[PDB]
Tab-separated table of N, CA and C in Angstrom:
chain	number	residue	atom	x	y	z
A	2	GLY	N	43.251	-39.478	11.610
A	2	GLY	CA	44.014	-38.256	11.418
A	2	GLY	C	45.402	-38.472	10.845
A	3	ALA	N	46.041	-39.576	11.244
A	3	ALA	CA	47.380	-39.887	10.761
A	3	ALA	C	47.404	-40.190	9.272
A	4	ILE	N	46.259	-40.548	8.688
A	4	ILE	CA	46.201	-40.786	7.248
A	4	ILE	C	46.744	-39.588	6.477
A	5	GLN	N	46.469	-38.368	6.954
A	5	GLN	CA	46.939	-37.175	6.251
A	5	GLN	C	48.452	-37.189	6.076
A	6	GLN	N	49.187	-37.586	7.111
A	6	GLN	CA	50.642	-37.527	7.027
A	6	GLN	C	51.196	-38.620	6.114
A	7	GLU	N	50.594	-39.814	6.150
A	7	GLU	CA	51.001	-40.892	5.247
A	7	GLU	C	50.745	-40.510	3.801
A	8	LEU	N	49.608	-39.867	3.550
A	8	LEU	CA	49.299	-39.434	2.200
A	8	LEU	C	50.241	-38.329	1.757
A	9	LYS	N	50.559	-37.396	2.654
A	9	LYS	CA	51.495	-36.335	2.303
A	9	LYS	C	52.855	-36.913	1.931
A	10	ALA	N	53.319	-37.919	2.681
A	10	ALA	CA	54.592	-38.561	2.359
A	10	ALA	C	54.574	-39.176	0.962
A	11	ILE	N	53.448	-39.776	0.564
A	11	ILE	CA	53.302	-40.297	-0.794
A	11	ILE	C	53.401	-39.171	-1.816
A	12	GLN	N	52.689	-38.066	-1.573
A	12	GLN	CA	52.744	-36.948	-2.506
A	12	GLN	C	54.165	-36.409	-2.632
A	13	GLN	N	54.886	-36.327	-1.512
A	13	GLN	CA	56.246	-35.802	-1.544
A	13	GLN	C	57.165	-36.712	-2.350
A	14	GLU	N	57.010	-38.027	-2.195
A	14	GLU	CA	57.822	-38.947	-2.977
A	14	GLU	C	57.501	-38.833	-4.464
A	15	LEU	N	56.225	-38.677	-4.799
A	15	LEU	CA	55.848	-38.522	-6.197
A	15	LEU	C	56.392	-37.226	-6.784
A	16	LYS	N	56.397	-36.137	-6.011
A	16	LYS	CA	56.984	-34.897	-6.507
A	16	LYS	C	58.460	-35.084	-6.847
A	17	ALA	N	59.199	-35.807	-6.003
A	17	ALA	CA	60.611	-36.053	-6.288
A	17	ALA	C	60.773	-36.880	-7.554
A	18	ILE	N	59.892	-37.863	-7.751
A	18	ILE	CA	59.905	-38.659	-8.973
A	18	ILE	C	59.675	-37.772	-10.186
A	19	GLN	N	58.745	-36.822	-10.079
A	19	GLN	CA	58.503	-35.941	-11.215
A	19	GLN	C	59.754	-35.150	-11.585
A	20	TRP	N	60.473	-34.632	-10.589
A	20	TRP	CA	61.699	-33.901	-10.893
A	20	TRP	C	62.751	-34.795	-11.535
A	21	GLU	N	62.820	-36.066	-11.138
A	21	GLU	CA	63.769	-36.968	-11.783
A	21	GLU	C	63.413	-37.168	-13.247
A	22	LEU	N	62.118	-37.235	-13.549
A	22	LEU	CA	61.698	-37.372	-14.937
A	22	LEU	C	61.991	-36.104	-15.724
A	23	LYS	N	61.811	-34.943	-15.097
A	23	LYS	CA	62.181	-33.701	-15.766
A	23	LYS	C	63.675	-33.649	-16.056
A	24	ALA	N	64.504	-34.179	-15.147
A	24	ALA	CA	65.945	-34.193	-15.387
A	24	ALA	C	66.286	-35.067	-16.584
A	25	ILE	N	65.633	-36.228	-16.694
A	25	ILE	CA	65.862	-37.114	-17.832
A	25	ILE	C	65.484	-36.421	-19.129
A	26	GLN	N	64.343	-35.732	-19.140
A	26	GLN	CA	63.917	-35.076	-20.368
A	26	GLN	C	64.860	-33.938	-20.747
A	27	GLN	N	65.403	-33.226	-19.755
A	27	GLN	CA	66.323	-32.130	-20.044
A	27	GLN	C	67.607	-32.645	-20.678
A	28	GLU	N	68.094	-33.804	-20.225
A	28	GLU	CA	69.271	-34.400	-20.849
A	28	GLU	C	69.008	-34.731	-22.312
A	29	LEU	N	67.794	-35.182	-22.628
A	29	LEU	CA	67.474	-35.528	-24.008
A	29	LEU	C	67.184	-34.288	-24.845
A	30	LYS	N	66.475	-33.315	-24.270
A	30	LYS	CA	65.913	-32.185	-25.002
A	30	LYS	C	66.832	-30.969	-25.030
A	31	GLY	N	67.584	-30.731	-23.960
A	31	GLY	CA	68.406	-29.537	-23.846
A	31	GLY	C	69.457	-29.386	-24.930
B	2	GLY	N	38.135	-32.243	3.412
B	2	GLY	CA	39.103	-31.920	4.447
B	2	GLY	C	40.542	-32.282	4.111
B	3	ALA	N	41.354	-32.461	5.155
B	3	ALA	CA	42.789	-32.658	4.970
B	3	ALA	C	43.098	-33.925	4.174
B	4	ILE	N	42.375	-35.013	4.439
B	4	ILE	CA	42.618	-36.261	3.719
B	4	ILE	C	42.289	-36.089	2.245
B	5	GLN	N	41.120	-35.512	1.957
B	5	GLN	CA	40.726	-35.313	0.569
B	5	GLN	C	41.694	-34.385	-0.150
B	6	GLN	N	42.222	-33.380	0.553
B	6	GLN	CA	43.183	-32.483	-0.079
B	6	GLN	C	44.446	-33.227	-0.491
B	7	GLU	N	44.898	-34.177	0.332
B	7	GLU	CA	46.095	-34.942	-0.014
B	7	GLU	C	45.822	-35.912	-1.152
B	8	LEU	N	44.646	-36.536	-1.156
B	8	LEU	CA	44.306	-37.424	-2.260
B	8	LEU	C	44.261	-36.661	-3.575
B	9	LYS	N	43.684	-35.458	-3.560
B	9	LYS	CA	43.712	-34.603	-4.743
B	9	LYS	C	45.142	-34.347	-5.196
B	10	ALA	N	46.008	-33.969	-4.260
B	10	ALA	CA	47.381	-33.639	-4.613
B	10	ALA	C	48.115	-34.846	-5.179
B	11	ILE	N	47.868	-36.033	-4.623
B	11	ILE	CA	48.490	-37.237	-5.163
B	11	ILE	C	48.023	-37.468	-6.590
B	12	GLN	N	46.718	-37.333	-6.824
B	12	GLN	CA	46.192	-37.566	-8.163
B	12	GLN	C	46.750	-36.563	-9.158
B	13	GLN	N	46.924	-35.309	-8.735
B	13	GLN	CA	47.548	-34.330	-9.617
B	13	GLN	C	48.991	-34.707	-9.934
B	14	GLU	N	49.743	-35.164	-8.928
B	14	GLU	CA	51.125	-35.559	-9.171
B	14	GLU	C	51.204	-36.745	-10.117
B	15	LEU	N	50.283	-37.696	-9.978
B	15	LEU	CA	50.266	-38.841	-10.874
B	15	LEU	C	50.006	-38.411	-12.309
B	16	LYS	N	49.077	-37.474	-12.510
B	16	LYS	CA	48.821	-36.975	-13.856
B	16	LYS	C	50.047	-36.273	-14.426
B	17	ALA	N	50.735	-35.481	-13.610
B	17	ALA	CA	51.935	-34.792	-14.077
B	17	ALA	C	53.032	-35.782	-14.453
B	18	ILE	N	53.213	-36.826	-13.639
B	18	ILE	CA	54.208	-37.854	-13.931
B	18	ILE	C	53.872	-38.557	-15.236
B	19	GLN	N	52.601	-38.900	-15.425
B	19	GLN	CA	52.214	-39.571	-16.657
B	19	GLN	C	52.446	-38.676	-17.864
B	20	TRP	N	52.237	-37.370	-17.709
B	20	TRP	CA	52.547	-36.443	-18.788
B	20	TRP	C	54.035	-36.457	-19.118
B	21	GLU	N	54.885	-36.428	-18.090
B	21	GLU	CA	56.327	-36.439	-18.326
B	21	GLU	C	56.767	-37.735	-18.995
B	22	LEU	N	56.171	-38.863	-18.605
B	22	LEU	CA	56.526	-40.138	-19.221
B	22	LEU	C	56.159	-40.159	-20.695
B	23	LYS	N	54.978	-39.646	-21.032
B	23	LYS	CA	54.596	-39.548	-22.433
B	23	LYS	C	55.571	-38.670	-23.206
B	24	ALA	N	55.991	-37.553	-22.612
B	24	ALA	CA	56.927	-36.660	-23.290
B	24	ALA	C	58.275	-37.330	-23.505
B	25	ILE	N	58.746	-38.087	-22.513
B	25	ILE	CA	60.005	-38.810	-22.663
B	25	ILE	C	59.892	-39.849	-23.767
B	26	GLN	N	58.795	-40.609	-23.784
B	26	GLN	CA	58.631	-41.615	-24.830
B	26	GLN	C	58.599	-40.974	-26.215
B	27	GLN	N	57.901	-39.843	-26.360
B	27	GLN	CA	57.875	-39.133	-27.640
B	27	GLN	C	59.275	-38.696	-28.053
B	28	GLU	N	60.025	-38.110	-27.119
B	28	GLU	CA	61.374	-37.643	-27.425
B	28	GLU	C	62.285	-38.793	-27.842
B	29	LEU	N	62.188	-39.933	-27.158
B	29	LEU	CA	63.044	-41.066	-27.494
B	29	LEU	C	62.670	-41.664	-28.844
B	30	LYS	N	61.375	-41.729	-29.162
B	30	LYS	CA	60.933	-42.335	-30.414
B	30	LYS	C	61.183	-41.416	-31.600
B	31	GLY	N	61.025	-40.109	-31.407
B	31	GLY	CA	61.100	-39.175	-32.517
B	31	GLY	C	62.227	-38.164	-32.454
C	2	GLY	N	35.521	-47.268	3.155
C	2	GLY	CA	35.552	-47.673	1.763
C	2	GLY	C	35.881	-46.582	0.761
C	3	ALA	N	35.468	-45.345	1.043
C	3	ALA	CA	35.757	-44.255	0.118
C	3	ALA	C	37.257	-44.018	-0.007
C	4	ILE	N	37.953	-43.904	1.127
C	4	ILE	CA	39.399	-43.694	1.081
C	4	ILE	C	40.094	-44.901	0.464
C	5	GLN	N	39.692	-46.105	0.862
C	5	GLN	CA	40.273	-47.312	0.292
C	5	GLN	C	40.131	-47.321	-1.220
C	6	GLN	N	38.963	-46.931	-1.729
C	6	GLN	CA	38.749	-46.930	-3.173
C	6	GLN	C	39.656	-45.927	-3.876
C	7	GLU	N	39.876	-44.764	-3.267
C	7	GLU	CA	40.812	-43.812	-3.857
C	7	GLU	C	42.236	-44.351	-3.836
C	8	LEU	N	42.597	-45.092	-2.788
C	8	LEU	CA	43.926	-45.681	-2.742
C	8	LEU	C	44.081	-46.772	-3.791
C	9	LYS	N	43.022	-47.543	-4.051
C	9	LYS	CA	43.083	-48.530	-5.124
C	9	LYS	C	43.238	-47.856	-6.482
C	10	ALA	N	42.560	-46.724	-6.690
C	10	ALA	CA	42.734	-45.981	-7.936
C	10	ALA	C	44.169	-45.482	-8.083
C	11	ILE	N	44.763	-45.009	-6.986
C	11	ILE	CA	46.162	-44.594	-7.004
C	11	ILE	C	47.067	-45.772	-7.354
C	12	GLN	N	46.818	-46.935	-6.752
C	12	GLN	CA	47.626	-48.110	-7.063
C	12	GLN	C	47.554	-48.452	-8.542
C	13	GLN	N	46.368	-48.326	-9.136
C	13	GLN	CA	46.225	-48.606	-10.559
C	13	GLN	C	47.080	-47.661	-11.399
C	14	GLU	N	47.111	-46.378	-11.042
C	14	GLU	CA	47.934	-45.432	-11.785
C	14	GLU	C	49.419	-45.720	-11.594
C	15	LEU	N	49.820	-46.130	-10.386
C	15	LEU	CA	51.219	-46.471	-10.150
C	15	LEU	C	51.633	-47.666	-10.994
C	16	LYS	N	50.729	-48.631	-11.168
C	16	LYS	CA	51.015	-49.759	-12.050
C	16	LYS	C	51.244	-49.286	-13.479
C	17	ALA	N	50.384	-48.388	-13.967
C	17	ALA	CA	50.558	-47.866	-15.319
C	17	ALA	C	51.900	-47.161	-15.464
C	18	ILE	N	52.290	-46.397	-14.447
C	18	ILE	CA	53.570	-45.693	-14.482
C	18	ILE	C	54.722	-46.683	-14.574
C	19	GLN	N	54.643	-47.777	-13.823
C	19	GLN	CA	55.697	-48.789	-13.876
C	19	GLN	C	55.832	-49.392	-15.267
C	20	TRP	N	54.703	-49.697	-15.918
C	20	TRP	CA	54.769	-50.266	-17.262
C	20	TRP	C	55.369	-49.275	-18.251
C	21	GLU	N	55.057	-47.988	-18.099
C	21	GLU	CA	55.653	-46.993	-18.981
C	21	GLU	C	57.157	-46.891	-18.759
C	22	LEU	N	57.597	-46.970	-17.502
C	22	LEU	CA	59.029	-46.934	-17.226
C	22	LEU	C	59.736	-48.148	-17.807
C	23	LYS	N	59.107	-49.321	-17.738
C	23	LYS	CA	59.705	-50.503	-18.347
C	23	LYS	C	59.814	-50.348	-19.857
C	24	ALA	N	58.830	-49.698	-20.484
C	24	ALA	CA	58.921	-49.448	-21.919
C	24	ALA	C	60.085	-48.517	-22.244
C	25	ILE	N	60.282	-47.480	-21.429
C	25	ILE	CA	61.399	-46.564	-21.632
C	25	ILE	C	62.723	-47.297	-21.470
C	26	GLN	N	62.833	-48.147	-20.448
C	26	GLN	CA	64.059	-48.914	-20.276
C	26	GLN	C	64.360	-49.775	-21.497
C	27	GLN	N	63.345	-50.446	-22.054
C	27	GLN	CA	63.598	-51.293	-23.220
C	27	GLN	C	63.967	-50.462	-24.446
C	28	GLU	N	63.341	-49.294	-24.599
C	28	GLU	CA	63.732	-48.362	-25.653
C	28	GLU	C	65.226	-48.059	-25.599
C	29	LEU	N	65.755	-47.809	-24.398
C	29	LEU	CA	67.166	-47.462	-24.252
C	29	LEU	C	68.071	-48.683	-24.346
C	30	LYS	N	67.652	-49.800	-23.759
C	30	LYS	CA	68.498	-50.985	-23.755
C	30	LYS	C	68.653	-51.561	-25.157
C	31	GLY	N	67.564	-51.626	-25.915
C	31	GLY	CA	67.593	-52.236	-27.231
C	31	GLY	C	67.725	-51.257	-28.380
D	2	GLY	N	42.452	-50.415	9.297
D	2	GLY	CA	43.386	-51.487	9.003
D	2	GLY	C	43.547	-51.722	7.513
D	3	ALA	N	42.422	-51.757	6.799
D	3	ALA	CA	42.477	-51.941	5.353
D	3	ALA	C	43.191	-50.779	4.676
D	4	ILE	N	42.917	-49.553	5.121
D	4	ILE	CA	43.617	-48.390	4.584
D	4	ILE	C	45.122	-48.540	4.775
D	5	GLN	N	45.548	-48.966	5.963
D	5	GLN	CA	46.976	-49.121	6.208
D	5	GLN	C	47.591	-50.162	5.282
D	6	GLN	N	46.865	-51.245	5.009
D	6	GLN	CA	47.375	-52.253	4.087
D	6	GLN	C	47.527	-51.690	2.682
D	7	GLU	N	46.599	-50.828	2.256
D	7	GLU	CA	46.737	-50.210	0.939
D	7	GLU	C	47.917	-49.254	0.903
D	8	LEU	N	48.154	-48.540	2.002
D	8	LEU	CA	49.311	-47.656	2.059
D	8	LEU	C	50.611	-48.445	1.986
D	9	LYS	N	50.672	-49.589	2.677
D	9	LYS	CA	51.844	-50.455	2.583
D	9	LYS	C	52.092	-50.878	1.140
D	10	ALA	N	51.023	-51.251	0.430
D	10	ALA	CA	51.164	-51.667	-0.963
D	10	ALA	C	51.623	-50.516	-1.849
D	11	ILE	N	51.104	-49.308	-1.608
D	11	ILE	CA	51.549	-48.151	-2.375
D	11	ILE	C	53.040	-47.933	-2.177
D	12	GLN	N	53.525	-48.082	-0.942
D	12	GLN	CA	54.955	-47.931	-0.688
D	12	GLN	C	55.768	-48.952	-1.470
D	13	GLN	N	55.262	-50.184	-1.576
D	13	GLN	CA	55.960	-51.197	-2.367
D	13	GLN	C	56.087	-50.767	-3.821
D	14	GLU	N	55.022	-50.190	-4.371
D	14	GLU	CA	55.043	-49.766	-5.764
D	14	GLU	C	55.936	-48.552	-5.961
D	15	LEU	N	55.940	-47.621	-5.001
D	15	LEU	CA	56.821	-46.463	-5.113
D	15	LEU	C	58.280	-46.890	-5.129
D	16	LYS	N	58.638	-47.848	-4.273
D	16	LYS	CA	60.005	-48.350	-4.279
D	16	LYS	C	60.348	-48.995	-5.616
D	17	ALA	N	59.412	-49.745	-6.200
D	17	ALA	CA	59.657	-50.318	-7.521
D	17	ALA	C	59.879	-49.229	-8.561
D	18	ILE	N	59.067	-48.171	-8.514
D	18	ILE	CA	59.222	-47.063	-9.448
D	18	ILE	C	60.586	-46.416	-9.288
D	19	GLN	N	61.023	-46.214	-8.047
D	19	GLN	CA	62.341	-45.631	-7.819
D	19	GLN	C	63.434	-46.463	-8.470
D	20	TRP	N	63.312	-47.789	-8.401
D	20	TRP	CA	64.329	-48.657	-8.977
D	20	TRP	C	64.249	-48.715	-10.494
D	21	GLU	N	63.047	-48.606	-11.063
D	21	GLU	CA	62.948	-48.485	-12.514
D	21	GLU	C	63.624	-47.206	-12.989
D	22	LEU	N	63.444	-46.115	-12.243
D	22	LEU	CA	64.095	-44.861	-12.600
D	22	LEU	C	65.604	-44.986	-12.507
D	23	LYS	N	66.099	-45.666	-11.472
D	23	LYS	CA	67.538	-45.879	-11.366
D	23	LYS	C	68.070	-46.620	-12.584
D	24	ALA	N	67.342	-47.638	-13.052
D	24	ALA	CA	67.781	-48.377	-14.235
D	24	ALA	C	67.827	-47.479	-15.464
D	25	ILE	N	66.835	-46.602	-15.617
D	25	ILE	CA	66.824	-45.697	-16.760
D	25	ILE	C	67.971	-44.701	-16.669
D	26	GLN	N	68.192	-44.137	-15.478
D	26	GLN	CA	69.279	-43.181	-15.306
D	26	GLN	C	70.621	-43.813	-15.653
D	27	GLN	N	70.816	-45.076	-15.271
D	27	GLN	CA	72.064	-45.758	-15.587
D	27	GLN	C	72.195	-46.013	-17.084
D	28	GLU	N	71.106	-46.419	-17.748
D	28	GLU	CA	71.141	-46.564	-19.204
D	28	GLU	C	71.604	-45.275	-19.876
D	29	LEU	N	71.113	-44.129	-19.399
D	29	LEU	CA	71.467	-42.856	-20.019
D	29	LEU	C	72.944	-42.522	-19.839
D	30	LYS	N	73.570	-43.035	-18.780
D	30	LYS	CA	74.994	-42.820	-18.559
D	30	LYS	C	75.870	-43.779	-19.355
D	31	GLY	N	75.283	-44.767	-20.024
D	31	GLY	CA	76.055	-45.737	-20.778
D	31	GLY	C	75.299	-47.023	-21.055
């Protein structure tokens, strides 16, 4: 059952990474 | 179930990140 | 084994992401 | 146990990705 929470933590970290990549692209593209 | 739902979400986030990386590389090259 | 195999697939994608980030770094550094 | 070992490895790769992003962000600042 605890696997769900470990996996969710991975997904949350990846979501934050995606926003950092969007910030980089906005600096280049904006 | 809950585990499979998180694995799906992780895989979706990975695809989104890879899309952003491709877009950044395109912007930097061109 | 099913969950382990999905985690190995995730690890493979994370490796690809790292190589793309290293390419972006070299684009900017050089 | 094997699943937990794969999760540990994923965390190692996520930390590496975070540091690659830090290097890119710093390049963009100068």
